[PDB]
Design a protein around this ligand. Sequence first.
Ligand SMILES: [Ca+2]
Length: 279
Amino acid sequence: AAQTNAPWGLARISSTSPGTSTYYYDESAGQGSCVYVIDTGIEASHPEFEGRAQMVKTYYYSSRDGNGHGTHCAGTVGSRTYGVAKKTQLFGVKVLDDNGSGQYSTIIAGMDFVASDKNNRNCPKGVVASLSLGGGYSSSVNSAAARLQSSGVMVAVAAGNNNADARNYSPASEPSVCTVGASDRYDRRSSFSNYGSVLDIFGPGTDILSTWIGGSTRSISGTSMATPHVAGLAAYLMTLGKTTAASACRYIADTANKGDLSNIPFGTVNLLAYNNYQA
Ligand SMILES: [Ca+2]
């Protein structure tokens, strides 16, 4: 399949080169997989989700995304126009309030919720969780992310936006999950992206067009935007049978565009997520 005039990040993850605008992908498009978006919620009624999104848990008075951030991330995972895996099922877990923040105890509960809740969902091709959130180092937050991954979910987490070593942030610093840095359309490390030996992969994170609340769209930037590119890629690859939840981060790193990013500090991977779709 080919989607012309796609957001640059979609075009980038199916290309060996920057500077193109068509997204190429196998038409299976993540069908039969599931992605949990653990964030501010998802505006499921948005036509862009085509009925494939649903809120399954909130820790607040409502399950509505009153912020937009979670809707944007979900759109990069799986919206029809802005998504990597255009046929995946999306499940929203609202651990962040409408101001975009959440207590670590609530975030931990949401991770353990996903580890159990996947047993209530039909995901024959596998389960992914996208965590575009984080704060300072916490062994408890890291151990929750580790449990979620151990339970058979491909966990993708944002590296953080501190232009610093991700070793000091959680869940970014949990070794066993897939820690995602951000790049721009000219293949630079995004100026704000964290780095370090704990990063597994980079994805597009600067000026990313996706869905927003009120049935809308907008472009925003962050490692929060890179993470759902990787989560959607994992779902896509698991539907194709190329990898599994336990192995997807390594598979993505193995098959990435290698050595192509600029402003990568010594000791940080120079790997950019790539679907290696070759019609
Ligand atoms: Ca890792």
